[PDB]
Design a protein around this ligand. Structure first.
Ligand SMILES: O=C(CC[C@@H](c1ccccc1)P(=O)(O)O)N(O)CCCc1ccccc1
Ligand SMILES: O=C(CC[C@@H](c1ccccc1)P(=O)(O)O)N(O)CCCc1ccccc1
Ligand SMILES: [Ca+2]
Ligand SMILES: [Ca+2]
Ligand SMILES: [Ca+2]
Ligand SMILES: [Mn+2]
Ligand SMILES: [Mn+2]
Lengths: 411, 411
């Protein structure tokens, strides 16, 4: 019987990849009902999607375009959706008994907030937003212990890969973000594969002078600017190291970053017997998104089969921490624990955007982050969920301000 | 609590690797009990193993070395094993209530009979003898349908790999050699990895000249002569294609042989969504053997962790069927069904031995096997288990004789 899905951020990359794979899978067999779509402010794309999927719910965050949506929707004949606005509309979707699975494809406050509401309503939450896990991992873990039937299923490609390598008979005795997930699943170590970004062959001298244009003009996957800069510094991978720690409870000393430039093996799991299982496919966000929606089952697709003999050659090498010091900073913050990951994420948000806007240089990114981390002091971690969310927000804002102050002091 | 194990073929490659990993796993805790050791005739080696492991049962096939074994074992103080012989001894071990799992590391008839008795006693059978599956696959399927608590767990490295790639939550709802195994496991296709053997890069003119000495001196792994020659002709992979079909109920058109000369990825499974899972490690029979004894759990080993950066490069290519025609013969025999696999296996046993002994040339191997296949006339499959076994043995003998007659004629 059907899989009832809501997509939060339906016009973004995750959202459209999700609708695409749902559409194709549904051509083969009708398994998916799209029950809700939520967008920030892209009222026109949202209308086109509603015309096609006819969800029970439409919600737009920006009440300024609220009226226009209602107007556009009247054209669709035989169609009376519940049309909502803002955070209240998001809460209403997450509390719907009609909805089983929620795809979070938005960033920032909206992304953490909608994750939280989806967890509080005991839903299966398909989560691509690695910054929410890195910054607010303690809050999510706490929430997932309150709301026992809620589950986060990883969509970030490497984390999906890890999850796909597992025996569901063991996964189902635990869940992601739980202490002891790795022990229950007999996980010893993770190989976290990376594209390596555009700068793997550059020298230190070259890196000293690279620009955001260099990072953006020739990326490894056509993506948003921020994640593109993170891929270039390998701070994306550093964030994904912490994401691996929180999702799977794997110790930092058991997470190894490996540069796999062909981007066919998506990541690998070493079990306690030293057997290694890996997941592989062409680079394509459809498989991670689909698995998040079908887990613990798989359904038929019409995706192109992997031609291993055509790919011919897979390569692996260790990243240089001297060339990609952001990786080292992520491990440092992770190992220190506490709210240092919150600080790392927030400070990187600022330093990333400074580099993007040509205000600092490549090695200034890691210098700023490093100086912010050094200025933080560990905080008593609140046992109360409300207080803990407030701590995370306060530390997040402090850390962004601190990064900005460090930039302005030097500049 | 301990897992009680019998090893059939304790002094061969599988048996010694089995005892090696059991010994390491038993250092602190009693994880396994070695209850029984069986060999064909290596009484001196068996005695050394008995001294260490003190099994309840010893068994030798060759009755002519019984008195020798009895005299050796006298030297072991306060040890009173049950010392058995031949097929009757195999039956008594397989029947013992004190034995849970049986490792079959012997070939030919002793391998088939021991497998059969293990199944008849509803044991877990860790099967490394692929020829039994190829020659007697439908008979084993029939037996497994009668003896509903017996399970075959694959130990052949590539088939262990396939098995490990599956999701045990689905595996537990079926069993190897059971109709519908691939449907239940959402299997679409198999990538069956091969070393390629010593002759993989030879031209056709060079290949015409190869000898058994060439195959034996530069092998891809240190192993028995028979399998080394099959690795060189890629008849080993052909046999493994049929093994794949029977174990996993995967159609022949969905099994793709891939030459992966690094021998790190052991095989891969494509599921119906087109996601591919693979299993990898250094070549080492310990992981396949251990997993067959621990499945569906895993236990800690002290094996060297895979260093993928050090490996650095993995390669994949299609084998040339003009150079390795034994592969094509195996697909043809398998697709024909009936007793064509029995005939394939039996004719190969002769042709391999002829080549080993310098009596025929490389392309004569596939020529003889092809001629025996063409000569065989399909037979109605006996419905009775005992009748079917008799039919198998008859056709096996016929095909060896026919192969010999063909060699004799063109000599
Ligand atoms: O986090 C990201 C983006 C950055 C990383 C990457 C990985 C593969 C290609 C290019 C870039 P990095 O450079 O940090 O290794 N991703 O998860 C890939 C999304 C696209 C994708 C790739 C493989 C499988 C499915 C989807
Ligand atoms: O059937 C065999 C022997 C023959 C094949 C092979 C494969 C890898 C190296 C050498 C030879 P083929 O040449 O037919 O591909 N085997 O299962 C490998 C046993 C050794 C082994 C290898 C990998 C993992 C664990 C154990
Ligand atoms: Ca004697
Ligand atoms: Ca598995
Ligand atoms: Ca098919
Ligand atoms: Mn990623
Ligand atoms: Mn093999």
């Amino acid at each position: 019987k059907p899989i009832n899905v809501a997509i939060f951020g339906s016009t973004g990359s995750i959202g459209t990849n999700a609708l695409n794979i749902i559409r194709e899978c549904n051509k083969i067999e009708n398994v998916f009902n799209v029950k809700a779509l939520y967008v920030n402010k892209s009222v026109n794309e949202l209308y086109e999607q509603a015309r096609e999927f006819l969800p029970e719910y439409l919600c737009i965050h920006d009440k300024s375009v609220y009226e226009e949506l209602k107007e556009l929707v009247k054209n669709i004949k035989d169609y009376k959706p519940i049309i909502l606005c803002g955070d209240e509309g998001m809460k209403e979707i997450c509390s719907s008994n009609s909805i089983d699975k929620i795809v979070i494809g938005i960033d920032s406050f909206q992304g953490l907030y909608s994750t939280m509401y989806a967890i509080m309503n005991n839903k299966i939450v398909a989560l691509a937003n690695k910054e929410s896990i890195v910054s607010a991992g303690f809050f999510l873990k706490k929430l997932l212990n309150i709301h026992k039937n809620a589950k986060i299923i990883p969509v970030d490609s490497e984390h999906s890969a890890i999850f796909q390598c597992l025996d569901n008979n063991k996964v189902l005795k635990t869940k992601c973000l739980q202490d002891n997930f790795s022990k229950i699943n007999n996980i010893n170590k993770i190989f976290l594969c990376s594209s390596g970004g555009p700068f793997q062959n550059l020298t230190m001298d070259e890196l000293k002078n690279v620009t955001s244009e260099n990072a953006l003009k020739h990326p490894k996957w056509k993506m948003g600017k921020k994640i593109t800069i993170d891929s270039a510094t390998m701070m994306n991978k550093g964030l994904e190291v912490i994401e691996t720690h929180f999702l799977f409870d794997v110790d930092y000393n058991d997470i190894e970053v490996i540069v796999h430039k062909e981007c066919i093996i998506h990541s690998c799991v070493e079990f306690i017997d030293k057997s290694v299982i890996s997941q592989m496919y062409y680079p394509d966000m459809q498989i991670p998104i689909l698995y998040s929606l079908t887990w613990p089952d798989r359904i038929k697709t019409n995706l192109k089969p992997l031609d291993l003999a055509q790919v011919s050659t897979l390569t692996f090498h260790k990243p240089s921490l001297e060339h990609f010091p952001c990786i080292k900073l992520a491990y440092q913050a992770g190992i220190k624990g506490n709210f240092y990951p919150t600080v790392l994420n927030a400070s990187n948000e600022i330093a990333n955007n400074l580099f993007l806007n040509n205000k600092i240089k490549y090695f200034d990114i890691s210098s700023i982050i490093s100086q912010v981390l050094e200025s933080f002091n560990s905080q008593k971690v609140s046992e109360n969920s409300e207080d803990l969310m407030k701590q995370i927000l306060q530390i997040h804002s402090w850390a962004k301000d601190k990064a900005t102050d460090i930039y302005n002091k030097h500049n």
